[PDB]
Symmetry: C2
């Protein structure tokens, strides 16, 4: 893919620009520049670039139906790559800080960044702050004169806040709301009353859907000067729908995918997370199954984790998943049909985003 | 002071706006809203508001010499308070994350936020991210239609990146540059070769001067639509000069101020920090004093920390300080004289900022 190859060559360019700027305006020395280059590569590279490439694909979709000089086609594609890298770097930030907050061990088959011997939490928290700063430095440099700059920066910032709010909802999901209090150590829920579909939907919506689907799609529109060409209410509803399904998939894999291909251990059970698997289990369990779940969930002991996994296999949650999948397919196709009214090209870009999500 | 009282009443307004927005657009529930309100109060309130009030003072200085309708005077003062709160919240962010990175215990006589029982590192890292997000949410809401918005956001972001870069320089200052490597646990310097005045000046410049002096002063100018009224090169040189002296003062107090009025223990010695005291000690020490410093610096043992403090008392570093102070006074008065050429009002605001710094 030449799309991919354009994306990646823009990474080398953006990294040279940020490092050269540190030398030339921030008095950095070469060994610290080298540590930051390594940091950038280790935290930003290695994934699928799904989010970044979504900006590129959305841009390419408009480029095929819009008259432009060559030099304009190139600038828009450049802008789409840079925008995509903003989003990858924002994600990198989230992952460095999250792995620290959660005491995670591995990420994509390597140690989490804060566990590199010469890093440590002391430097890794800061490194994660710098990752997000770089998304701004990028925007101001590459987009200084762009008519979309204000709207892109404003959306970026809203998406970032929504994600941070989401992470809060996530990490406090195993506590009873009425017991949240900075003055009192948070005890795990015993009733699991807040393990419902609506609550789960709130966590996922804020925690991942803004930055994983909304941001890439709208960004593709901005760089293409095409926002006024779509119904924004639909982009939102489709981004939140496809974003939820995406997270449901990760939740199932956390439990059932082998660590080898997960790249991680998977500790949602021990961590007592409000996962789709738990919420769906409690939505179908009989009384005795609920009691057994409660005696076993949220505990590091591998025998108790096997009891939960066994309850999930026996509740047949692969059927509730095929059913949730079938409903999402229906609603996604419906939203794409609505998006054809004002833009058949954007609609088709959304179909490709969905198709790439549905396969995994 | 009515200045103070305006500043603080703007805090209540901004906090109500951010919490009401979380309820109305982010589906927050009351107990999480209450945790965020507490977080905001504990991390943002309690200090001197030196940085925030600097924006207010700079605005008030222009207001006394510029013709405006009353409603415009109020909006500018409102804008100056909001801008000041942005800076206080940015600082709050830095302090939450820093106390975590450094394993700090106390801050202004209370436990560091991540040590509150119901917080934990898991939530505190995120809380610190949210603190900084709020500075953006503020800017976009209160300043949406302001002609200074782009320039304020661009400067904010540059100052933030410079601070993060500075923190990196700070926390790696005890290592030999040529040994920095994410793959290798960082050993403490033995030669202390990088403990020089120029290196020290680099750390302080980025670590604190941008956000503590440059940002507040330039922000006061933006909200007042007065940037074109000053020589920006001088504001920079004065902000960096006064900012350094400010940090030298904290470095001396870390060592010699009683914990009671410091609000902290003070562990620069144990932490092997490139402090002004160390750098100045090595700039005057004889060979035997240098050897003794080396056998004792950077170690948690209270007997070795007393040996360093004793070497500092015996090297008579209160004289190098009076001398550094006398030189800063000279250069600060010189820069204020230069600033009178294009703005006597701004110059006088800089004199007050300096006078408030010099006393402490």
């Amino acid at each position: 893919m030449a799309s991919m190859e354009r994306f990646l060559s823009v990474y080398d360019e953006v990294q040279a620009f940020l490092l050269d700027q540190l030398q030339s305006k921030y008095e950095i020395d070469p060994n610290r520049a080298r540590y930051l280059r390594i940091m950038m590569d280790t935290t930003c590279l290695g994934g699928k670039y799904f989010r970044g490439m979504t900006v590129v694909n959305v841009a390419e979709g408009f480029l095929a139906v819009t008259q432009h000089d060559e030099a304009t086609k190139e600038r828009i594609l450049h802008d789409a790559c840079v925008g995509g890298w903003m989003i990858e770097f924002l994600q990198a930030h989230y992952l460095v800080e999250d792995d620290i907050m959660d005491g995670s061990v591995m990420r994509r088959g390597k140690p989490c960044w804060y566990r590199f011997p010469g890093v440590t939490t002391q430097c890794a928290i800061n490194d994660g702050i710098i990752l997000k700063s770089w998304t701004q430095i990028m925007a101001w440099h590459y987009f200084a004169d762009r008519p979309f700059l204000k709207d892109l920066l404003c959306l970026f910032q809203k998406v970032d806040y929504a994600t941070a709010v989401g992470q809060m909802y996530d990490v406090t999901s195993m506590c009873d709301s009425n017991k949240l209090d900075p003055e009192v150590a948070q005890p795990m829920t015993t009733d699991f009353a807040e393990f419902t579909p609506a609550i789960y939907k709130r966590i996922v919506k804020y925690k991942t859907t803004f930055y994983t689907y909304l941001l890439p799609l709208v960004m593709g529109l901005f760089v293409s000067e095409a926002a006024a060409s779509v119904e924004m209410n639909l982009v939102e509803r489709v981004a939140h729908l496809i974003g939820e399904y995406f997270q449901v998939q990760d939740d199932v894999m956390d439990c059932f995918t082998p660590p080898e291909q997960l790249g991680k251990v998977g500790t949602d059970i021990e961590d007592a997370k409000c996962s789709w698997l738990a919420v769906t289990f409690l939505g179908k369990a009989n009384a005795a199954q609920v009691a057994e779940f409660k005696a076993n969930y949220g505990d590091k002991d591998p025998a108790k984790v096997a009891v939960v996994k066994r309850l999930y296999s026996e509740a047949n949650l692969q059927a509730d998943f095929a059913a949730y999948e079938a409903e999402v397919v229906r609603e996604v196709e419906s939203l794409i049909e609505q998006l054809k009214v004002k833009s058949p090209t954007f609609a088709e870009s959304v179909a490709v985003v969905w198709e790439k999500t549905h396969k995994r």
